[PDB]
């Protein structure tokens, strides 16, 4: 037990999944901090030194981290791995990124099994002295993820099909909405600098008309104001905050990936 194998991830969700696979035999750190916007994060010099100190770097791919490839050019002799390998992307459906992969694949718990296997495989490949701990921890964590499916569906089972509309600010929930039979509506399709600020807001306020959607949400790394506005101009309650792009701090409501899924579904459910 000298200095432990060091893994650096781009953001907090991957950090928590990887630390569950690593257990005590490896140290997993995230480049972005809890609460920080991850799509257009601007790396600092201290971020370079952190990534350069790693034995292995994990990132999402599906162009989630618009900043990563340019950043990674400053890192030498450190292998990286894309943890969404083998996931089939859902395309973005409107706006200037229409047709690009929707990168929020981790919001489907069945996809998280694929994240887990990609991370396990990378850990075993580059740290083979601990292949037994990594292989045991991954199987145990995959079983925790599989166990979520029944309580999650049961928690949402009081909402009838026609009523299952999920109205959020970022369209970050397409993978979760597909898994649990929700229709998605959103103020913008993916976080970015962009136009369409008030026109999608009026188009969303539209769809809330004929479907009498009762509740709309925001998310933890972006401004809650546009959702709160939509709630004002309609009769819909503001139900947010949902979690997708970041965990909370270790003492906050959402310190782990499992707590992020459970609490996001729980908040949708109570919103209805």
Interacting residues with Zn ion (CB under 5 A): 5, 79, 125, 172, 191, 245
Helices 199-211 and 225-233, interaxial angle, to 10°?
A: 50
Q: Among residues 155 and 229, whose Cβ is nearest to Zn ion? A: 229
Binding-site residues for Fe(2+) sit at: 39, 104, 170, 245
Nearer to Zn ion, 71 or 173 (CB): 173
| Shortest CB 1 distance to Zn ion, Å | 6
CA 194 distance to own-chain centroid? 21
| Minimum separation from the CB atom of position 79 to Zn ion (A) | 5
Nearer to Zn ion, 155 or 164 (CB): 164
Q: What is d(CA 57, CA 231) in angstroms, rounded to the nearest whole number?
A: 41
CA distance 200 to 195: 9
Q: Which of 195, 22, 167, 173 is nearest to 95 (CA)?
A: 195
Backbone φ and ψ of 91, nearest 5°: -75, 150
Count of C-beta atoms within a 10 Å radius of residue 18: 26
Q: How far is the CB of 12 from Zn ion (least distance, A)?
A: 12
Measured from the CB of residue 82, what is the shortest distance to Zn ion in angstroms? 10
CB of 111 or CB of 191, closer to Zn ion:
191
Q: Write down the least CB distance from residue 71 to Zn ion, Å.
A: 18
Shortest CB 103 distance to Zn ion, Å: 7
How far is CA 53 from each of CA 25, 81, 142, 164, rounded to the nearest angstrom? 17, 16, 29, 46
DSSP bridge pairs for 184: 166
Q: How many CA atoms lie within 13 A of 264 on its CB side?
A: 30
Q: How many CB atoms sit inside 10 A of residue 192's CB? A: 13
Q: Which is nearer to Zn ion, 23 or 155 (CB)?
A: 23
Given the structure tokens 């495989």, which residue do they identify?
Answer: 121
Binding residues: 39, 104, 170, 245
Question: Could you give the CA distance from residue 99 to residue 92 in angstroms, rounded to a whole number?
Answer: 5
């Amino acid at each position: 037990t000298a200095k432990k194998f060091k893994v650096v991830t781009t953001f907090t969700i991957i950090q928590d999944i990887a630390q569950n696979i690593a257990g005590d035999v490896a140290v997993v750190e995230s480049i972005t901090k809890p609460g920080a916007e991850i799509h257009d994060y601007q790396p600092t010099p201290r971020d370079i030194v952190k990534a350069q100190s790693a034995d292995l770097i994990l990132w999402n791919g599906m162009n989630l981290e618009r900043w990563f490839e340019k950043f990674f050019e400053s890192i030498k002799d450190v292998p990286s791995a894309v943890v969404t390998a083998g996931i089939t992307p859902l395309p973005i459906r409107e706006g200037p990124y229409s047709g690009i992969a929707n990168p929020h694949a981790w919001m489907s718990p069945s996809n998280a099994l694929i994240y887990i296997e990609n991370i396990r495989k990378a850990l075993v490949e580059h740290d083979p002295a601990h292949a037994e701990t990594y292989n045991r921890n991954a199987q145990a964590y995959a079983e925790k993820i599989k166990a979520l499916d029944a309580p999650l569906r049961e928690r949402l089972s009081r909402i009838p099909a026609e009523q299952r509309w999920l109205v959020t600010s970022e369209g970050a929930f397409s993978y979760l909405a597909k898994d649990y039979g929700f229709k998605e509506v959103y103020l913008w399709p993916i976080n970015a600098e962009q136009q369409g600020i008030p026109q999608q807001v009026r188009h969303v306020i539209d769809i809330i008309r004929e479907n009498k959607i009762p509740v709309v949400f925001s998310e933890s790394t972006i401004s809650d104001k546009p959702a709160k506005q939509v709630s004002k101009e309609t009769g819909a309650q503001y139900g947010g905050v949902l979690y997708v792009d970041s965990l909370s701090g270790e003492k906050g409501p959402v310190p782990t990936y499992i707590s992020l899924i459970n609490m996001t579904v729980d908040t949708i459910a109570k919103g209805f």
